[PDB]
Each structure stands twice: as C-alpha cells, then as structure tokens.
C-alpha cells in the first residue's frame, strides 16, 4: 500500500492498516472487498474514560468515503456511550489521512446528550522485527 498514492479504500482493502489521530488514539482496521470495515480502536483522548484498551469498531466504505462506529464497552471498561465517525480519506503531504466528524452519544448531567467533534487520522506504516524474542 503506497500511502503517497492512495486512490480509495480499495488501495487498503484486503489487508490491515493502522491509523493515529491528533489526540493520540489509534485504530487498526480491515476493509474487505464488499465495503465492510472491522477493526479495533484504542482511545487515549485526554479527559475521557475507556483509554488504553481495544474496543471493537465496525463500519462501511464507499470509494473514498467512510463511516465507522464504536460502542464503549469491551468487558474491560464500560463507559455506557457510543461514537460514530463519518468522513473521507485523502492524500495529504505524501501520507494518507482520514478526515472525520464524530458524534458521541452518552448520559449527560440532565439526560442523554450528543457531543460533536472532528478527528483526523494519519496512516501509520507497520514496523517490522525478525522475531518476537529480543
């Protein structure tokens, strides 16, 4: 996968790809040839619960457009919320990024509320070792 020449999600379909946003959160995703997205999301956004453990992520792609969803209970920590992100991939400065808007639905002070924000994910190329033993 040439991240400097990403065309659409089929450039990255059929193998895993890793991503990191501006807040330190990471995700690893699988895009199949039918437009499905699976993956795992690790939240590290300052001030939030449910950090540093993987949460299942699902979604859908159409060309360069994507939408994906995370529920905030993985059996390690339950934050009783959900986030949906929607956006698109593009090549920016010889890497690829996914530009998104998100909604977080949660229990607020006076009842259920939806918080909005934006995340941009940068592609993270794999690192490689000879073997698992140092």
């Amino acid at each position: 996968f040439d991240a400097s020449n990403f065309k659409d999600f089929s450039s990255i379909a059929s193998a895993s790809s890793s991503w990191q946003n501006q807040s330190g959160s990471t995700m690893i995703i699988q895009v199949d040839s039918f437009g499905n997205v699976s993956g795992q999301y690790v939240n590290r956004a300052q001030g939030t619960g449910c950090q540093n453990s993987p949460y299942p992520l699902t979604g859908r792609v159409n060309g360069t457009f994507i939408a994906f969803s995370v529920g905030w209970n993985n059996s390690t920590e339950n934050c009783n919320s959900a986030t949906g992100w929607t956006g698109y991939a593009q090549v920016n400065g010889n890497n690829t990024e996914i530009v998104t808007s998100w909604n977080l639905a949660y229990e607020g002070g006076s009842g259920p509320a939806i918080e909005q924000g934006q995340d941009t994910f940068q592609y993270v190329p794999t690192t490689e070792n000879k073997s698992l033993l140092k």
Copy 2:
C-alpha cells in the same frame, strides 16, 4: 428491563427489529449478544439518490447507546457517500424509538464535504402470515 431476565435467554440475548424514520426510510437490524449490529437500510428521503434498494448497515451498541454506518453503494446504485448515525434508544407512547444525529460525507461542488442532521426511528412490529401464498 428487569423482566427480560426472566425469559428465554436465546430470545433476549439478541434482537431482530425493524424501524422507520420521519422521512420514511427504513432499516432492519440484528443486534447480537456481543454488541455487533448488522442490517439493511432503505432510503426514501424525498428527492435524494439511492432510494428504494437495500444498503448494508453495520454498527455497535453499548447499553441504550448505538452508532451505525451505511456506505451508499450496493451495486444497484452508487451515490459515492457515507452516513454515520449516533444516538440512543428510549421509550415513548408505548413504543421504542432511536433518537440520532447523523453526518453525511459526500462529494460537493468544491470537494469532499460533511452535511449534518437528525433522524428519529420508530420501532415497526412484524406482520405475520400463514405462508408466502396465504396471509
């Protein structure tokens, strides 16, 4: 719902349910015991592309909260865009509803753009027939 603890486990561990929003769009969803949502969405929003054919949907649930996603290509019609909904289930007037905000990412005049909105889905009860041939 505490009473759900005192029923058949298999029947309550998962959900199969239909929903209609205020625009007449429908979705059919399956929620499994692990939190995974699958289903099919049929758009009927007035004046839009990609109406009247089913589009895959996928999502996650946590408690009463839900997020789900649809890409707008099913090989019948491609609208080159994607929508993400986020919200929650609640009860009113003796029916369950899902209250959501959505984002739509699409190719606008100037390049990619995001449109925002709200949808509320009402639960739709199953119709039951004797057979495919007789009601």
